[PDB]
Enzyme design. Structure first.
Site, PDB file in Angstrom:
ATOM      1  N   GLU A 121       1.191  -6.827   0.418  1.00  0.00           N
ATOM      2  CA  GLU A 121       2.459  -6.309   0.923  1.00  0.00           C
ATOM      3  C   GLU A 121       3.235  -7.412   1.641  1.00  0.00           C
ATOM      4  O   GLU A 121       4.447  -7.532   1.469  1.00  0.00           O
ATOM      5  CB  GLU A 121       2.239  -5.110   1.850  1.00  0.00           C
ATOM      6  CG  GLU A 121       1.415  -3.978   1.230  1.00  0.00           C
ATOM      7  CD  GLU A 121       2.188  -3.145   0.223  1.00  0.00           C
ATOM      8  OE1 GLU A 121       3.368  -3.445  -0.067  1.00  0.00           O
ATOM      9  OE2 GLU A 121       1.616  -2.160  -0.275  1.00  0.00           O
ATOM     10  N   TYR A 134      -3.157   0.542  10.216  1.00  0.00           N
ATOM     11  CA  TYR A 134      -3.414   1.888  10.704  1.00  0.00           C
ATOM     12  C   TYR A 134      -4.670   2.482  10.058  1.00  0.00           C
ATOM     13  O   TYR A 134      -5.521   3.011  10.768  1.00  0.00           O
ATOM     14  CB  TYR A 134      -2.177   2.769  10.482  1.00  0.00           C
ATOM     15  CG  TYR A 134      -2.323   4.233  10.846  1.00  0.00           C
ATOM     16  CD1 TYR A 134      -2.293   5.221   9.853  1.00  0.00           C
ATOM     17  CD2 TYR A 134      -2.463   4.640  12.179  1.00  0.00           C
ATOM     18  CE1 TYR A 134      -2.394   6.579  10.177  1.00  0.00           C
ATOM     19  CE2 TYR A 134      -2.576   6.000  12.514  1.00  0.00           C
ATOM     20  CZ  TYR A 134      -2.541   6.958  11.506  1.00  0.00           C
ATOM     21  OH  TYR A 134      -2.647   8.294  11.821  1.00  0.00           O
ATOM     22  N   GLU A 192       4.437  -5.702  -8.010  1.00  0.00           N
ATOM     23  CA  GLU A 192       4.786  -4.324  -7.679  1.00  0.00           C
ATOM     24  C   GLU A 192       4.642  -3.359  -8.853  1.00  0.00           C
ATOM     25  O   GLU A 192       4.166  -2.239  -8.680  1.00  0.00           O
ATOM     26  CB  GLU A 192       6.177  -4.252  -7.052  1.00  0.00           C
ATOM     27  CG  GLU A 192       6.236  -4.990  -5.701  1.00  0.00           C
ATOM     28  CD  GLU A 192       7.616  -5.002  -5.074  1.00  0.00           C
ATOM     29  OE1 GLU A 192       8.536  -5.635  -5.633  1.00  0.00           O
ATOM     30  OE2 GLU A 192       7.772  -4.394  -3.999  1.00  0.00           O
ATOM     31  N   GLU A 243       7.913   2.251  -3.858  1.00  0.00           N
ATOM     32  CA  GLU A 243       7.680   1.309  -4.950  1.00  0.00           C
ATOM     33  C   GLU A 243       8.476   1.623  -6.219  1.00  0.00           C
ATOM     34  O   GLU A 243       8.860   0.711  -6.950  1.00  0.00           O
ATOM     35  CB  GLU A 243       6.181   1.232  -5.266  1.00  0.00           C
ATOM     36  CG  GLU A 243       5.686  -0.175  -5.540  1.00  0.00           C
ATOM     37  CD  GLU A 243       6.010  -1.120  -4.403  1.00  0.00           C
ATOM     38  OE1 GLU A 243       5.482  -0.935  -3.283  1.00  0.00           O
ATOM     39  OE2 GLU A 243       6.817  -2.045  -4.623  1.00  0.00           O
ATOM     40  N   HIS A 250       4.510  -0.764   4.916  1.00  0.00           N
ATOM     41  CA  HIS A 250       3.322  -0.708   4.078  1.00  0.00           C
ATOM     42  C   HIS A 250       2.189  -1.509   4.710  1.00  0.00           C
ATOM     43  O   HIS A 250       1.058  -1.027   4.773  1.00  0.00           O
ATOM     44  CB  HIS A 250       3.612  -1.181   2.647  1.00  0.00           C
ATOM     45  CG  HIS A 250       4.664  -0.379   1.945  1.00  0.00           C
ATOM     46  ND1 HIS A 250       5.211  -0.762   0.741  1.00  0.00           N
ATOM     47  CD2 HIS A 250       5.285   0.776   2.286  1.00  0.00           C
ATOM     48  CE1 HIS A 250       6.109   0.127   0.361  1.00  0.00           C
ATOM     49  NE2 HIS A 250       6.177   1.069   1.282  1.00  0.00           N
ATOM     50  N   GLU A 267       8.220  -3.044   3.138  1.00  0.00           N
ATOM     51  CA  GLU A 267       6.969  -3.813   3.018  1.00  0.00           C
ATOM     52  C   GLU A 267       6.260  -3.983   4.365  1.00  0.00           C
ATOM     53  O   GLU A 267       5.027  -3.991   4.427  1.00  0.00           O
ATOM     54  CB  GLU A 267       7.203  -5.197   2.399  1.00  0.00           C
ATOM     55  CG  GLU A 267       7.941  -5.202   1.059  1.00  0.00           C
ATOM     56  CD  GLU A 267       7.241  -4.406  -0.047  1.00  0.00           C
ATOM     57  OE1 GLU A 267       6.065  -4.018   0.108  1.00  0.00           O
ATOM     58  OE2 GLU A 267       7.872  -4.183  -1.101  1.00  0.00           O
TER      59      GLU A 267
HETATM   60 FE   LIG Z   1       7.240  -3.005  -2.913  1.00  0.00          FE
HETATM   61 MN   LIG Z   2       4.971  -2.452  -0.912  1.00  0.00          MN
END
Ligand SMILES: [Fe+3]
Ligand SMILES: [Mn+2]
Ligand SMILES: [Fe+3]
Ligand SMILES: [Mn+2]
Lengths: 334, 327
Positions: free
Chosen positions: B96, B136, B200, B234, B130, B127
């Site tokens: 990411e 987390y 991606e 995405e 993400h 990102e």
């Molecule tokens: Fe992405």
């Molecule tokens: Mn991403």
């Protein structure tokens, strides 16, 4: 999650030398950090940066969520004066492109040289917020039926707006040079001046005078939709400024040799120049007074916040003026 | 009509020339025109992607991990099931950041258009979210975070993917790199294919399937729900990337040589091979609902779909073994 580590819950390395590239927390630095992998967020060293990031993420808003119907009715009525309209239009003109200048500077200048994943994490939040703020001004133009090409080009058409933005370009420095580096005293001092130019001067000084003008309208129940959006912007800008201050001080603390008497004095002079340009801008906005506002109040106010910004980066106040707008430090619950 | 005084009066009666001519605007190599000014918006698809992204706000911390934590620490998951989860977290945790850093350090400078940049700002922040998701998850499950984040240095099949990403990134980061030549712009476009289409569009989707299969069986649903939000992001990233690549092609037809097209096909082929290798490292035996051979088909299926989108012929002609991923 205070339970036992279950067996089979670790992933096996098949590159036995790979372990060495795990990041040591105490090896992390704000700038010039090439000794550790910058792509791994963990372990987080700069808690202040991560906190700013979490705080910003909790402040999500969109301009399109704020109803403009009442602003539209007021704007279209004869109940606003020509002088009131001028204040509004000049502010929308300055802000419409200022946010892009801040946003582009984060990406094209700052990000590359802040070699720390948690601070970069905040920077991406901040840059996005600048996108939201740019959106705000398009939404206001379209809501009020203003000529958006006229508004967005203001910084090429209005001298007092242009002088602020040309000053900004000058303090941007050589940072945009593809070959610019921070791995020398001179380079790092240059980079800090950019940080002062954008966080302290643009976001911390140039915006606040506009905030006062617009939030005054709001306090008087005029253009409450624009006012409410500026409230969300001010909530964002407060964090932007606090991060900048923390970034500047952290860099100073990690590289004490850049913070020389000469650099300190240079920074004071840039801030002094910024104060004069902001006052001149305020004078252009208010050739005549509107309710509870005149150009002379901005002499005291701009100098006052300039003192507050100075103190926060360890330099002495120099103006010692009263704040004519103490209500700007009121807590607004949005 | 409009009330008196609704217009700002210029005192630089000369600055109006700097107003942006819509039709002058270009995706790349556009330095004739003021790039700071958002208006007038030319590329409406880019602005539309931006607005759509903004309506998709989510935070990984909104999603309860209680049930995931209980399941992770119990003896209910097999060692093989844990292996799939750990490797995917390992890959995603840094990838990411690779994507986010490339947007800023490579793509933004050379996309000389404000509305497209506006979307790039949104994508880069997405990102960051993400990346936060993976921190987390690690903290919630009590995973060794340095072990998970450093996985792309410790696991061969992951490193192979990211070493490939580094290669296809090209010289775009080089201070001397420019897009104002055929070769320069071709190299820039290859970076776009590498990140939007390959990273991606292929690597991530394959991992989506592995995690969302757990979610489908009511296992690790906190992780699953986060991945659903990531997938939602995405979809737009990929859609924007495809529009950007095709937009650059249309405005610069000279770069899209038979040579470039074949170069791109070979890069996608290699990506396919690497992701299949990665899938086999994830699933040496196969767990309930997941076998490596299904990823042979799936990776090839999605590669074909990505090829079509950028005007290239599909080459594998395999079917989708995960019809649900469409829904
Ligand atoms: Fe992405
Ligand atoms: Mn991403
Ligand atoms: Fe800001
Ligand atoms: Mn802003």
């Amino acid at each position: 999650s205070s339970g036992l580590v279950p067996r089979g819950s670790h992933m096996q390395a098949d590159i036995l030398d790979g372990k060495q590239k795990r990041v040591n927390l105490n090896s992390k630095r704000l700038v010039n950090c090439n000794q550790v992998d910058v792509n791994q967020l963990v372990p987080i060293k700069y808690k202040w940066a991560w906190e700013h990031y979490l705080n910003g993420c909790a402040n999500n808003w969109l301009p399109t969520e704020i109803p403009m119907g009442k602003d539209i009715e007021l704007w279209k009525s004869d109940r606003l004066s020509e002088d009131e309209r001028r204040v509004i239009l000049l502010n929308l003109g300055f802000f419409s492109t200022a946010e892009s200048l801040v946003g582009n500077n984060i990406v094209l200048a700052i990000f590359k040289h802040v070699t720390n994943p948690e601070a970069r994490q905040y920077l991406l939040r901040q840059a996005f917020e600048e996108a939201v703020h740019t959106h705000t001004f398009l939404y206001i133009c379209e809501s009020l039926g203003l000529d958006e090409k006229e508004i967005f080009n203001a910084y090429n058409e209005r001298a007092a707006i242009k002088a602020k933005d040309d000053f900004q370009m000058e303090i941007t420095g050589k940072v945009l040079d593809p070959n610019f580096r921070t791995d020398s005293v001179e380079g790092l001092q240059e980079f800090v001046k950019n940080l002062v130019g954008y966080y302290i001067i643009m976001e911390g000084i140039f915006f606040y005078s506009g905030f006062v003008m617009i939030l005054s309208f709001h306090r008087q129940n005029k253009m409450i939709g624009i006012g409410e959006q500026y409230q969300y912007i001010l909530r964002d800008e407060t964090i932007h400024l606090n991060f900048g201050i923390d970034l500047i001080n952290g860099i100073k603390e990690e590289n004490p040799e850049i913070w020389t008497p000469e650099l300190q004095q240079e920074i004071v002079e840039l801030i002094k120049r910024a104060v004069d340009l902001e006052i001149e801008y305020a004078q252009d906005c208010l050739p005549r007074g509107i309710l509870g506002l005149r150009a002379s109040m901005f002499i005291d106010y701009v100098q006052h916040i300039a003192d507050r910004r100075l103190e926060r980066i360890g330099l002495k106040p120099i103006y010692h003026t009263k704040n004519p707008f103490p209500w700007m430090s009121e807590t607004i619950d949005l």
